[PDB]
Fold this sequence. Notes:
8 chains; C: 230 residues; E: 49 residues; 1 helix; rod-shaped; binds a molecule of 5 linked components (NAG-NAG-BMA-MAN-BMA); binds a molecule of 5 linked components (NAG-NAG-BMA-MAN-MAN); binds the ligand CCCCCCCC/C=C/CCCCCCCC(=O)O[C@@H](COC(=O)CCCCCCCCCCCCCCC)COP(=O)([O-])OCC[N+](C)(C)C; membrane protein; human muscle; nicotinic acetylcholine receptor
Amino acid sequence: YTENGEWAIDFCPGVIRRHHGGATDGPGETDVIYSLIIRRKPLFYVINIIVPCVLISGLVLLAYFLPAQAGGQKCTVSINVLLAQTVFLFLIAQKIPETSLSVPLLGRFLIFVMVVATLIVMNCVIVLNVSQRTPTTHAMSPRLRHVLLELLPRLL
Amino acid sequence: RTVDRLCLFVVTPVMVVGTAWIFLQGVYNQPPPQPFPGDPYSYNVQDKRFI
Amino acid sequence: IENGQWEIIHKPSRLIQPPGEGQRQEVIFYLIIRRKPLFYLVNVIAPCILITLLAIFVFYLPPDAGEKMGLSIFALLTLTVFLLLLADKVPETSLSVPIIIKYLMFTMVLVTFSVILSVVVLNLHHRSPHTHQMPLWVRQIFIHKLPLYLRLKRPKLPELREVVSSISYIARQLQEQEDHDALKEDWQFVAMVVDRLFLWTFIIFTSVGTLVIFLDATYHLPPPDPFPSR
Amino acid sequence: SDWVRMGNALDNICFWAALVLFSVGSSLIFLGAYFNRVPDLPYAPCIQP
Amino acid sequence: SDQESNNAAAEWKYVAMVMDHILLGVFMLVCIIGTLAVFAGRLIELNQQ
Amino acid sequence: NGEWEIVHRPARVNVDPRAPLDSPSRQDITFYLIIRRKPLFYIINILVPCVLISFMVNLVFYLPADSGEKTSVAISVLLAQSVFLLLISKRLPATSMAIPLIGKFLLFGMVLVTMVVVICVIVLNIHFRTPSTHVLSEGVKKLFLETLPELLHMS
Amino acid sequence: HFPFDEQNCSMKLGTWTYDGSVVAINPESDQPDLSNFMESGEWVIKESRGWKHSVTYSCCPDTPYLDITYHFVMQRLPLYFIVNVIIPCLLFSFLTGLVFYLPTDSGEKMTLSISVLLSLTVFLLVIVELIPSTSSAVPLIGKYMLFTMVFVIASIIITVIVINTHHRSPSTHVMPNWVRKVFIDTIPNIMFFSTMK
Amino acid sequence: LPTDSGEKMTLSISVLLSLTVFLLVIVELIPSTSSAVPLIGKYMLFTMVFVIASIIITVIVINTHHRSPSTHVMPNWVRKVFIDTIPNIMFFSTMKHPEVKSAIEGIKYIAETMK
Lengths: 156, 51, 230, 49, 49, 155, 197, 115
Ligand SMILES: *[C@@H]1O[C@H](CO)[C@@H](O[C@@H]2O[C@H](CO)[C@@H](O[C@@H]3O[C@H](CO[C@H]4O[C@H](CO)[C@@H](O)[C@H](O)C4O)[C@@H](O)[C@H](O[C@H]4O[C@H](CO)[C@@H](O)[C@H](O)[C@@H]4O)[C@@H]3O)[C@H](O)[C@H]2NC(C)=O)[C@H](O)[C@H]1NC(C)=O
Ligand SMILES: *[C@@H]1O[C@H](CO)[C@@H](O[C@@H]2O[C@H](CO)[C@@H](O[C@@H]3O[C@H](CO[C@H]4O[C@H](CO)[C@@H](O)[C@H](O)[C@@H]4O)[C@@H](O)[C@H](O[C@H]4O[C@H](CO)[C@@H](O)[C@H](O)[C@@H]4O)[C@@H]3O)[C@H](O)[C@H]2NC(C)=O)[C@H](O)[C@H]1NC(C)=O
Ligand SMILES: *[C@@H]1O[C@H](CO)[C@@H](O[C@@H]2O[C@H](CO)[C@@H](O[C@@H]3O[C@H](CO[C@H]4O[C@H](CO)[C@@H](O)[C@H](O)[C@@H]4O)[C@@H](O)[C@H](O[C@H]4O[C@H](CO)[C@@H](O)[C@H](O)[C@@H]4O)[C@@H]3O)[C@H](O)[C@H]2NC(C)=O)[C@H](O)[C@H]1NC(C)=O
Ligand SMILES: *[C@@H]1O[C@H](CO)[C@@H](O[C@@H]2O[C@H](CO)[C@@H](O[C@@H]3O[C@H](CO[C@H]4O[C@H](CO)[C@@H](O)[C@H](O)[C@@H]4O)[C@@H](O)[C@H](O[C@H]4O[C@H](CO)[C@@H](O)[C@H](O)[C@@H]4O)[C@@H]3O)[C@H](O)[C@H]2NC(C)=O)[C@H](O)[C@H]1NC(C)=O
Ligand SMILES: CCCCCCCC/C=C/CCCCCCCC(=O)O[C@@H](COC(=O)CCCCCCCCCCCCCCC)COP(=O)([O-])OCC[N+](C)(C)C
Ligand SMILES: CC(C)CCC[C@@H](C)[C@H]1CC[C@H]2[C@@H]3CC=C4C[C@@H](O)CC[C@]4(C)[C@H]3CC[C@]12C
Ligand SMILES: CC(C)CCC[C@@H](C)[C@H]1CC[C@H]2[C@@H]3CC=C4C[C@@H](O)CC[C@]4(C)[C@H]3CC[C@]12C
Ligand SMILES: CC(C)CCC[C@@H](C)[C@H]1CC[C@H]2[C@@H]3CC=C4C[C@@H](O)CC[C@]4(C)[C@H]3CC[C@]12C
Ligand SMILES: CC(C)CCC[C@@H](C)[C@H]1CC[C@H]2[C@@H]3CC=C4C[C@@H](O)CC[C@]4(C)[C@H]3CC[C@]12C
Ligand SMILES: CC(C)CCC[C@@H](C)[C@H]1CC[C@H]2[C@@H]3CC=C4C[C@@H](O)CC[C@]4(C)[C@H]3CC[C@]12C
């Protein structure tokens, strides 16, 4: 026996079933059912899809450490991670089952990280909007100033 | 800025006209009225050729 | 029923005798067929030529625009897309490399070197004057000798005492800024000269390599005879 | 400068928020698989070791 | 003179920023309205079945 | 059929006069189907997106040189066109009788986008010139600051 | 209505060479037997039914032609298409509008919008491989895809116009009076008004 | 690539994007099995981790470059490690009407502002 490259056979019980022996049914029927309980070996998906996707999706957190100026490229890092995630969506569409009884873990993780990246893109946009305000267009909102510069260090 | 404006007014009409030409060849592409060129017959059940 | 991708050049047939009782003759029908490559010219070769042209034109982009990296690297990304396009069409054997794959890898190497040399040019351009001292030989080569060959001509009472001190300090600071700007201009001119040298070198290498590969492809003709002398 | 420092403070709090969201969601999604082992059935293994 | 030039430029920037605020509102509203106008009719129809 | 509409459907008895009577190729009956493609799928999914994206490269002329995002827009349009070319490459045979109409448009658009990228490079080169690097001649000023803006009705 | 579509598919059965005057077929039951039906991971059979039909042609008034047609009304399970197609499109549609909250001085508006457009263009691969390539009608999913593409396109056009407006200076333009009246005077009065005139 | 170019993230993220697009080529060409990691797979994952690490460290370098002098104050250990010791191994250069009185104070203010 040579094990399948992707599937390990963990269990394989057999059972002889008998049914349709009722008076209305009439003649009894029988069959033999074997249940191959098989386990996927996920190494290919781990190496080729999941680990690269995890790292590339984690790159969005680096946007918070880039400067909020013209040359910061904060939005460069976030939206291009989303583009890479779209490429991974194309990659994963070639492999996942096409049924709709439930959602696979791979697809759920990809959609989750895409939603997180979208939220962080919005967050970077907001931080850039706040950071480059100048007196020639915006007034100094003292409420947000007090909230962020005075109350926030006290909370921390 | 002047070079950019001139390049707009030169390049954009060329793109529009070329795209329009290329897609107008296809939009007006239709099969001929008769299945066989040179044969006027339509080969339709309306136009029966009684013997 | 003519094939849209293949042209039949020769179509002979031959009786093959056994090598001189269990021996068997054969009748072999040969089809010598030439591919008609218009699809690959439209879908692969022309985009590669255009991307190569953009890789050349990166070196004319000024460093202050801040756009060399984007252009060169997106050219590389587009070439990767065309590698994905070719992945479904090319043969999978390993006895030799298709010439189209050779051309694609030549183009990718060219774009990689365009990225590398653009990085070098930007490093020269943004060089800090105070931290970096220009060595003299750099001056002699890239500011005096090479611009001639590349056709780059570089153009060309306590109050009163306190006031005097302030004015003198302001003049001193502006003179320091002038010297700093002069050294910065020297570094930027060196970067420009190096960029022009790379532009000409890239044009020459691109033209020579493309011409060599295209002549190798063009002069690969089908055999005049199905059974040439060997 | 005041605007820049407000933006920096926003970035600082939001980084921790985003890190917590990313880590917790990914960990839950993959721990769903970690608790998805084949059940310990009352049968001998299919392949005798 | 540079100050007058800066004032005129700042007026142009203010006009652009007001346009951006209006367009942000319009595009978010368009996102919601298009998403509804596409799917909601069929989803409501299936909800009634 | 969901993609093909039958326009003509003739039937014909074909007799080859040159063939001998004892040849199977002497006679046949041919039923022809002239079928027109219903192009709605390709229109909606390929052609309108590709055409609009290609036309987007013209906005770079209205983008100021100080934005720093001209060549990025143009080369990104080229990348999108290459993606569309990858899309088309799977759907048609690699025949040589003609270039497909979508293929003709895509080649035309990639060529134009390449010229637009080159024009953007030249425009950026002109924009960032300084006295320390270039000399601005009076003839260039006369042509590009007074005559052409008046002809082009520029503000 | 794809992927929320309902499909009524039939199975017309009949004796090919025997007419009703020699061989007669009758349904065993009003409905097909689904007692041993395996669960489908993509469709739900809401209704199933068999109907017998007899057709008599005028040229053959003595030999009726019989058939039994078994129909199956089926509703697609749309979860796969919701997760893999609709949600990414919704995310792109949401990301489209965020460029208008980006400052022009950030130098990243075109980066954001064009990257969203590139994401949609790459996503077209997923859509066309997953969506059915038929021209009988435009699917709902195709309508949404075209909507998102067209409005990312519109956002790019308007963003270029906005950036052009932002960089104007008295060395290039002179502001018309109507622009001043509309944008500096009237509109902020009917807005939150935190902005300084 | 200097930080002042404003293109570090462009280069690094676009190299990552090219590698991600090339992953489609890799999965198209090499066989997909989980019996063991192929040598191509090991090299691919090494390149991916290499690019990710380069991006992370580039973000750190950019953050270091842009540190403001007011909010941030340079610790002594950073100065001793990077300005003093390491460059010895390399080769870089280490680094009486009121109106008249009002005008005088204005000149002094300009000088102090530039200071
Ligand atoms: C892998 O797959 C195999 C095959 O599917 C699994 O083994 C089978 O598991 C099913 C349950 O999923 C089990 O079905 C049960 O059968 C018994 C026996 O049925 C007989 O007796 C009952 C009366 O006792 C009669 O009602 C019936 O007519 C008959 O001949 C049922 O008692 C039992 O009912 C219970 O569970 C139902 C839900 O499943 C519930 O609705 C009901 O009220 C009651 O609580 C089941 O119907 C099969 O017998 C198993 N064996 C075979 C040979 O199929 C195996 O478990 C799977 N492995 C894993 C790890 O999931
Ligand atoms: C879709 O494709 C089918 C083919 O698969 C096309 O059908 C062909 O249509 C053409 C034009 O009608 C036909 O060509 C004509 O054939 C006639 C008969 O030729 C037979 O007899 C001669 C000997 O007399 C044999 O050598 C020959 O092999 C045939 O057995 C000719 O008489 C016609 O000639 C007349 O028209 C030409 C026009 O150029 C004049 O020059 C002549 O002087 C004369 O007036 C003509 O050659 C062809 O035979 C058809 N093929 C088949 C298989 O039937 C459909 O037209 C096409 N549909 C489209 C494109 O819409
Ligand atoms: C497409 O593919 C087919 C099949 O491979 C090629 O057909 C072969 O063509 C080659 C030449 O190109 C033939 O080789 C030549 O055979 C001649 C006769 O050899 C026969 O007789 C000897 C003696 O009895 C036998 O041993 C042998 O098996 C044959 O039965 C030789 O006289 C030729 O000699 C020439 O080439 C040799 C090369 O080493 C020189 O040393 C000689 O001086 C001389 O120049 C030669 O060997 C071969 O037999 C063909 N095969 C068949 C089955 O017909 C087509 O050529 C190829 N088409 C292309 C590529 O265009
Ligand atoms: C999916 O597609 C299938 C097939 O197209 C549809 O099947 C149709 O379903 C309807 C409704 O169930 C059928 O209509 C009914 O047909 C009965 C039988 O008619 C045949 O047999 C009689 C007797 O021999 C012939 O006289 C007749 O010509 C036919 O050959 C009728 O008895 C029914 O009449 C009853 O309902 C009508 C309602 O209008 C009343 O007016 C009558 O008085 C009476 O109460 C009725 O006409 C239809 O025949 C089916 N067609 C086929 C081809 O199977 C499915 O409905 C569809 N599923 C969906 C979309 O839900
Ligand atoms: C895309 C289509 C083609 C281009 C359309 C352009 C449309 C826009 C129109 C361009 C005109 C702009 C004029 C500005 C300069 C005025 C002053 C002047 O001419 O003298 C000075 C500047 O000389 C130049 O800069 C040369 C003229 C412009 C060169 C444009 C790039 C090269 C294009 C070539 C064709 C590319 C073909 C391949 C691509 C298809 C002299 O100083 P110099 O230092 O001696 O100048 C060296 C100039 N050189 C480096 C260019 C040699
Ligand atoms: C958007 C973020 C927050 C979540 C991203 C993951 C998405 C795809 C997850 C989150 C919750 C999930 C759902 C939770 C529970 C169920 C019920 C189950 O019987 C079928 C699957 C279904 C309907 C899941 C489908 C996938 C799902 C919608
Ligand atoms: C935006 C335009 C200018 C680009 C040019 C290319 C495309 C979009 C143009 C060129 C010519 C155009 C067609 C010319 C005529 C018709 C027939 C009419 O009954 C419907 C519109 C339609 C089909 C036009 C729209 C699309 C079309 C094919
Ligand atoms: C990703 C983050 C943000 C949200 C996670 C939410 C959790 C609770 C969700 C995500 C996916 C969900 C699972 C998706 C599908 C199924 C299969 C179904 O037959 C039973 C429920 C079950 C097992 C769900 C349970 C709840 C679940 C684990
Ligand atoms: C800028 C706008 C017009 C979008 C670009 C439209 C382009 C792709 C053009 C090229 C060919 C055109 C088609 C050609 C022919 C027709 C006529 C009629 O059957 C309805 C419209 C229809 C089907 C056109 C729709 C638009 C179309 C697909
Ligand atoms: C309205 C725009 C801005 C956003 C939504 C996308 C647009 C392009 C979509 C939404 C509905 C679509 C229409 C829906 C149905 C039909 C009828 C048939 O002839 C096919 C094309 C046509 C006419 C479609 C053309 C494209 C369309 C108008």
